[PDB]
Short mmCIF file of C-alpha atoms in Angstrom, two decimals:
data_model
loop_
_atom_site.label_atom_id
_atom_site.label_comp_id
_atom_site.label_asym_id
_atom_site.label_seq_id
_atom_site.Cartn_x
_atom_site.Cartn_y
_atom_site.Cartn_z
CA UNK A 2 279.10 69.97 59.86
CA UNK A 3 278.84 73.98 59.99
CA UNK A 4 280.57 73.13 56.64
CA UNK A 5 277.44 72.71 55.12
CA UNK A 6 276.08 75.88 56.73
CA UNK A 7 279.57 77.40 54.80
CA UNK A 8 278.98 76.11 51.63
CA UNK A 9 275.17 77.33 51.92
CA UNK A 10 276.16 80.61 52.90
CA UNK A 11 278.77 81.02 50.42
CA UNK A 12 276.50 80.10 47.60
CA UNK A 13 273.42 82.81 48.50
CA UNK A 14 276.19 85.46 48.95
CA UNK A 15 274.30 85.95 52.30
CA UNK A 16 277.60 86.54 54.46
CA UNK A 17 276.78 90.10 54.50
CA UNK A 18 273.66 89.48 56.12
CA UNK A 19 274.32 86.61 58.59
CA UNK A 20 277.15 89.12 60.02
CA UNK A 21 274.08 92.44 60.00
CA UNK A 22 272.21 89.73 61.82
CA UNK A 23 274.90 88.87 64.77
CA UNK A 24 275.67 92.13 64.58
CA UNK A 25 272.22 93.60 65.88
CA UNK A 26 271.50 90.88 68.10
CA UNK A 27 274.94 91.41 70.24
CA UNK A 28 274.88 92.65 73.34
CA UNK A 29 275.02 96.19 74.59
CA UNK A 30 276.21 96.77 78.24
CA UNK A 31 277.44 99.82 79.58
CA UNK A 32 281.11 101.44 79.36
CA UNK A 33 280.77 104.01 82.33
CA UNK A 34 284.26 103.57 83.80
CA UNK A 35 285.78 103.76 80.51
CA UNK A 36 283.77 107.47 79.59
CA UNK A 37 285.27 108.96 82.30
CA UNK A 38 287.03 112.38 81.46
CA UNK A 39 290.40 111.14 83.79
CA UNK A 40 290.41 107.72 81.64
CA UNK A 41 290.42 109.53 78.06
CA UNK A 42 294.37 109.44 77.87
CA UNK A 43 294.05 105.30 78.83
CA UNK A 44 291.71 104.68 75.70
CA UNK A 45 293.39 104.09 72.15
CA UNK A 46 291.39 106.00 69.24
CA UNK A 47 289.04 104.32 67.39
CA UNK A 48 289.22 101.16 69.60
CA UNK A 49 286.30 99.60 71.65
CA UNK A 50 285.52 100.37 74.92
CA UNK A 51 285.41 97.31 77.48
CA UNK A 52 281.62 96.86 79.18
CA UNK A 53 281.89 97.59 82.92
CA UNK A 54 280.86 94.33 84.18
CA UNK A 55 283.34 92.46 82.55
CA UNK A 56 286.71 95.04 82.71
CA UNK A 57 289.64 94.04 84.28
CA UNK A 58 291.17 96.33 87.25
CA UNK A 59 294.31 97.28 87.72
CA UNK A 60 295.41 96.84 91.67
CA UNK A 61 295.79 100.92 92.33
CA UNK A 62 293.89 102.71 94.32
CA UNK A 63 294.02 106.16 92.28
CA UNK A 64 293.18 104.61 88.92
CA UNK A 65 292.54 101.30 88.21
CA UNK A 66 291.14 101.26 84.76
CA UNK A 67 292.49 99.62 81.40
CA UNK A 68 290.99 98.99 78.36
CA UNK A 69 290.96 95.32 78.32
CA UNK A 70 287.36 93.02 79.08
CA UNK A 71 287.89 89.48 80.29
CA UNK A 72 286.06 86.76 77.96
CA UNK A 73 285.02 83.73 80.15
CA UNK A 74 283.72 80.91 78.30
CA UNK A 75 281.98 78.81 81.06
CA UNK A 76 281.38 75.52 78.99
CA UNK A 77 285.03 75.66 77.37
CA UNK A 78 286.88 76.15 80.60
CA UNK A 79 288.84 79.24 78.85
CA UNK A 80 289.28 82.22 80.02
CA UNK A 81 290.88 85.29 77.73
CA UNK A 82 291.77 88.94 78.22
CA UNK A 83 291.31 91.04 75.68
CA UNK A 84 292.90 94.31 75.34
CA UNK A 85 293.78 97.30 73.30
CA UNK A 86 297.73 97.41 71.94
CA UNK A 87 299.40 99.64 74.44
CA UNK A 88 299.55 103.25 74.13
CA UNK A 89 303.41 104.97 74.86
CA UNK A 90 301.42 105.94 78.51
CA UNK A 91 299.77 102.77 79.32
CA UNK A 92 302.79 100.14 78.87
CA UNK A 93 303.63 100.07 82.66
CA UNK A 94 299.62 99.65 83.55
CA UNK A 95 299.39 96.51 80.67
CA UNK A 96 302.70 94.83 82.45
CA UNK A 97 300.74 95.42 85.71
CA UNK A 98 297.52 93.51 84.03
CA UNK A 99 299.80 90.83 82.91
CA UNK A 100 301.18 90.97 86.44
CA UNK A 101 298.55 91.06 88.43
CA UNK A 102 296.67 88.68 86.26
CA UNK A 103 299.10 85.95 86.19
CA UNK A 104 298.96 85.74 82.64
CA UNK A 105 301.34 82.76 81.42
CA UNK A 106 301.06 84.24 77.78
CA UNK A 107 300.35 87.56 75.61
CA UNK A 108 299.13 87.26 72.11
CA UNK A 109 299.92 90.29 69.50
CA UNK A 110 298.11 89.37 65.96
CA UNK A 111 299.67 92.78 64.61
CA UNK A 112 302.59 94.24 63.63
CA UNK A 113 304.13 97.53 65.12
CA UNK A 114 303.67 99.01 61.63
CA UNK A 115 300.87 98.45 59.69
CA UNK A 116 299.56 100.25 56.24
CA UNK A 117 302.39 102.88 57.44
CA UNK A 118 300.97 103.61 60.49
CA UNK A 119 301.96 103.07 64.20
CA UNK A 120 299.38 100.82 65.88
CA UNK A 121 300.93 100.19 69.21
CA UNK A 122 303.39 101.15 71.14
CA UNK A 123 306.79 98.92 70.79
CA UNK A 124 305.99 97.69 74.80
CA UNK A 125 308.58 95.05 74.53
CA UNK A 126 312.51 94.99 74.17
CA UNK A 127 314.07 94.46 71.14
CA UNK A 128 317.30 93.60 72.90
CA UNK A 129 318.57 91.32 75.45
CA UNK A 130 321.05 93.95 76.60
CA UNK A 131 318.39 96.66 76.80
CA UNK A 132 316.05 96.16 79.27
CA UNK A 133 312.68 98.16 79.84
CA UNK A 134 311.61 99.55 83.24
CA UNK A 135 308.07 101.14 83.66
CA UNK A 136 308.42 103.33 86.52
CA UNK A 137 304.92 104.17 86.73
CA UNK A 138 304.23 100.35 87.82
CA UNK A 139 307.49 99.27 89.02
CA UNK A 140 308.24 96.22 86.63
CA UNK A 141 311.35 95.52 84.50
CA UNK A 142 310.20 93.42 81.46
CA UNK A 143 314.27 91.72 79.59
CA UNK A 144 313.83 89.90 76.87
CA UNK A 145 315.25 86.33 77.08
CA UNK A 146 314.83 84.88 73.66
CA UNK A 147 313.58 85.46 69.98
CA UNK A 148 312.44 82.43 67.69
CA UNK A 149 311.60 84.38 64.03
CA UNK A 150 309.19 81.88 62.09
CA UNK A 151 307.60 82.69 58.62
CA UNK A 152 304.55 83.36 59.92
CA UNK A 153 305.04 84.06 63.40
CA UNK A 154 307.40 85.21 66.19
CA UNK A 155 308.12 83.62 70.13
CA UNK A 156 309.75 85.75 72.71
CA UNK A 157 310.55 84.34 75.97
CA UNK A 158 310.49 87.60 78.42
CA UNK A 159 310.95 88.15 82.24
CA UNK A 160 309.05 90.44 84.32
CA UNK A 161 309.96 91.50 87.46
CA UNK A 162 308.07 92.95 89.88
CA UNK A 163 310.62 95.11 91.04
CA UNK A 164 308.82 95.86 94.87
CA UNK A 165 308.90 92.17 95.42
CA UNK A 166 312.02 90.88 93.28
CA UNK A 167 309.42 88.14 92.50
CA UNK A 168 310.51 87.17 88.28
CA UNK A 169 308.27 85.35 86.04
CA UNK A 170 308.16 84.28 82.59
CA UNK A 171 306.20 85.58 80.06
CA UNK A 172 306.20 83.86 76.66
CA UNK A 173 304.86 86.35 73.80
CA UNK A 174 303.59 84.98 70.55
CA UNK A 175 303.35 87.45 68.10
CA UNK A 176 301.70 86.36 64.43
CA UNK A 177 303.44 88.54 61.76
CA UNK A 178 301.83 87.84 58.68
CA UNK A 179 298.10 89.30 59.35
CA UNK A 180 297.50 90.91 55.96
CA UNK A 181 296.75 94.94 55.91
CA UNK A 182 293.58 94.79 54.12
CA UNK A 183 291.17 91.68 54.23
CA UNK A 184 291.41 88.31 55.59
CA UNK A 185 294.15 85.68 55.34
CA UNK A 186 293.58 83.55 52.25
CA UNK A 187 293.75 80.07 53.87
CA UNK A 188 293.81 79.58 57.45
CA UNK A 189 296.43 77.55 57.86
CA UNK A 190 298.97 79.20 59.12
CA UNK A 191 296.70 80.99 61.76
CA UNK A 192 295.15 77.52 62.86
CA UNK A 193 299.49 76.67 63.26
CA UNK A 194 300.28 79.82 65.36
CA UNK A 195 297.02 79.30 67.71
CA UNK A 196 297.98 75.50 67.77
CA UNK A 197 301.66 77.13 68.86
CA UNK A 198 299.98 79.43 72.04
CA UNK A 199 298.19 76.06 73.25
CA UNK A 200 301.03 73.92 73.25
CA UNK A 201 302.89 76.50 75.30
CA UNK A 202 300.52 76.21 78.01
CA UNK A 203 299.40 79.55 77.60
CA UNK A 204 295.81 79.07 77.37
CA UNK A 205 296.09 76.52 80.26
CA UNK A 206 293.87 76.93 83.50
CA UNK A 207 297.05 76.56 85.64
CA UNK A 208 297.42 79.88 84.42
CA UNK A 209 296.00 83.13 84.30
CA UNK A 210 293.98 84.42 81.14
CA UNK A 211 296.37 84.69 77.85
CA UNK A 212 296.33 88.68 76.77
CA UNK A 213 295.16 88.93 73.59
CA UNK A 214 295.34 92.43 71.49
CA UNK A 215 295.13 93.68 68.06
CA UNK A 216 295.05 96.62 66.14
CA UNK A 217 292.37 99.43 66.76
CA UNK A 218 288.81 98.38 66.38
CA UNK A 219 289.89 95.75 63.49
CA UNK A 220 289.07 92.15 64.91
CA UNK A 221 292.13 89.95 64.87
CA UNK A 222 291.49 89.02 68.89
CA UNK A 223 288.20 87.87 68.68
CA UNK A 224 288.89 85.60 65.62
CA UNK A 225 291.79 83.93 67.84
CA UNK A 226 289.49 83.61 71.04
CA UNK A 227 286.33 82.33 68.78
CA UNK A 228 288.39 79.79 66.79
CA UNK A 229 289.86 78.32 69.88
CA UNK A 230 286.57 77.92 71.99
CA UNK A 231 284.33 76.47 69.17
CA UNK A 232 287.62 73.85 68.42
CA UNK A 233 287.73 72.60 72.08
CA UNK A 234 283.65 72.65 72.50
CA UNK A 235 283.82 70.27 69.51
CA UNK A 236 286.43 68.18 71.14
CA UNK A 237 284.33 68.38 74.42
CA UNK A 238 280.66 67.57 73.42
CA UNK A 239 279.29 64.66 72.78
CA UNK A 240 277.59 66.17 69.83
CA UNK A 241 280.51 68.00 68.15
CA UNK A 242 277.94 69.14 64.84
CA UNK A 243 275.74 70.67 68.13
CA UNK A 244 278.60 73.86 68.07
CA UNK A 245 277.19 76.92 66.58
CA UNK A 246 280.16 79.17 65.47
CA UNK A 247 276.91 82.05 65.61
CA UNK A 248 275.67 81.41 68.92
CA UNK A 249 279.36 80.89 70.80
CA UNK A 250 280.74 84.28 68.99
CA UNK A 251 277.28 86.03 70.39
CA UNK A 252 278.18 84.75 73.83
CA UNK A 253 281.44 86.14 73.69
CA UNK A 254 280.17 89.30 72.67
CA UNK A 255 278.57 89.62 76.03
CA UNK A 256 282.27 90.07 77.45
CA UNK A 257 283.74 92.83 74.86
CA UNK A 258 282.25 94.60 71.44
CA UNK A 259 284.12 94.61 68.43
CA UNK A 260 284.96 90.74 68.22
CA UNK A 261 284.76 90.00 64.54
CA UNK A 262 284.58 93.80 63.01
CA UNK A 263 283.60 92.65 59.17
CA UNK A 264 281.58 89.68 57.34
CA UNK A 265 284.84 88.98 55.77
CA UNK A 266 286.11 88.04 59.41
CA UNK A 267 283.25 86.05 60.08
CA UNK A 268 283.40 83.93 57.25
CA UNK A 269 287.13 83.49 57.90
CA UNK A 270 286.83 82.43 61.35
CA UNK A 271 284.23 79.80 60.15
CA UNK A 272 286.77 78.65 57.77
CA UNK A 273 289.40 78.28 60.59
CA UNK A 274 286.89 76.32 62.95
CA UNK A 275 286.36 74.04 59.94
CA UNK A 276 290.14 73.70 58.84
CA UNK A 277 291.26 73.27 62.23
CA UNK A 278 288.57 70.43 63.21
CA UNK A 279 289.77 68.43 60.36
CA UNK A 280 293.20 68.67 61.56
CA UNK A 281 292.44 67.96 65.65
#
C-alpha cells in the first residue's frame, strides 16, 4: 500500500521535501479574468485565484466572475467546485453558483470564527423564522433544519429562485472541529463527515458539483476533494496499490492552486486515504 510509502516517508523526515517537490511540479495556468481591476472587490484576501480555463461563470451578462475553479476528475467520475468562503458582497453571486450549478450539496470545513478572526461571511440563516434574500441575485435561501454533531453540523436549506418560484434543496455539511493551527490528529472523524456528504448524495452525478470552501489560502478543500477521489479510484481499479495519492493531487492541481497549502496537509491527507481504505 501507499502505507509503506507513509511509513518510509515518515522515517527520512522527507515530508518537507516530497511536498517542495509537488509543489514545483504543479501547474501554472493563467488567472486573467480574476486580475481584472472590476473583479478586485469579488476576490477574498490572501486566497487563490481560480485559473481561467477551469472558472466557473456566473449566468450575467455584466459580470460573471467568482472565485471558485471546477475540479473534474475524469477517471473518478467526480466533479467538485471549489470556492472561496463568501465575502458580505458576493453571498447573492455564490447562491447563484449553487443555483445555476445545480449543486445538491455545499461543504464548509471552517468555522465563521477562527483564531478570532472572521473568515467568511455568515451566508446562511441561523433561523428558521429569519429568512435571507440576496437582492442582487434574486434568491431567498430559509433554513429548514439543523442536526449539531460533535464533529460536524447538517443544515437542510431551501433556495428559491425567486424570478421563477422554482425551490430546491440544498443540504449544507459544515465540519466544526478543523483545528486553528495544524492538522487533525487522527483522521477519523474527517473520513466520518466526508463518509456523511456521500451518503447524502451530494457528491452524486445525478447532481451538480458539491461546493466546497475553506478558509483563505489554508487547504481544508483540497484535502476533502483529494481524499475522496484517491478512495473511490481504489474502489474502482483493478489495481487499487496502482493509486498514487502524488500523481492524483498533481492532477487536481491543474483545476485550482492552493490544494494542500503545507507538508503537514499532505501527510494528513495520506493518512486519511489510508484510514479510510481500511474502513471501505
Amino acid at each position: 500500500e501507499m502505507e509503506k510509502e507513509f511509513e518510509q516517508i515518515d522515517k527520512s523526515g522527507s515530508w518537507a521535501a516530497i511536498y517542495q517537490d509537488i509543489r514545483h511540479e504543479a501547474s501554472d495556468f493563467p488567472c486573467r479574468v480574476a486580475k481584472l481591476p472590476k473583479n478586485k472587490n469579488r476576490n477574498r484576501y490572501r486566497d487563490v485565484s481560480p485559473f481561467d480555463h477551469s472558472r466557473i461563470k456566473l449566468h450575467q451578462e455584466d459580470n460573471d466572475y467568482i472565485n471558485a475553479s471546477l475540479i473534474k476528475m475524469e477517471e473518478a467520475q467526480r466533479s467538485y467546485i471549489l470556492t472561496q468562503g463568501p465575502l458580505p458582497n458576493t453571498c447573492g453571486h455564490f447562491w447563484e453558483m449553487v443555483w445555476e450549478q445545480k449543486s445538491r450539496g455545499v461543504v464548509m470545513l471552517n468555522r465563521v470564527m477562527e483564531k478570532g478572526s472572521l473568515k467568511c461571511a455568515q451566508y446562511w440563516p441561523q433561523k428558521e423564522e429569519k429568512e435571507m434574500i440576496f437582492e442582487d441575485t434574486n434568491l431567498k435561501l430559509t433554513l429548514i433544519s439543523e442536526d449539531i454533531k460533535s464533529y460536524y453540523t447538517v443544515r437542510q436549506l431551501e433556495l428559491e429562485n425567486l424570478t421563477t418560484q422554482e425551490t430546491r434543496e440544498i443540504l449544507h455539511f459544515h465540519y466544526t472541529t478543523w483545528p486553528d493551527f495544524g492538522v487533525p490528529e487522527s483522521p477519523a472523524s474527517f473520513l466520518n463527515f466526508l463518509f456523511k456528504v456521500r451518503e447524502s448524495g451530494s457528491l452524486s452525478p445525478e447532481h451538480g458539483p458539491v461546493v466546497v470552501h475553506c478558509s483563505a489560502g489554508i487547504g481544508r478543500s483540497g484535502t476533502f476533494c483529494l481524499a475522496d477521489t484517491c478512495l473511490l479510484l481504489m474502489d474502482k481499479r483493478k489495481d487499487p496499490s496502482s493509486v498514487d495519492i502524488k500523481k492524483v493531487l498533481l492532477e487536481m492541481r491543474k483545476f485550482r492552486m492552493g490544494l494542500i497549502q503545507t507538508a503537514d496537509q499532505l501527510r494528513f491527507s495520506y493518512l486519511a486515504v489510508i484510514e479510510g481504505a481500511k474502513f471501505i
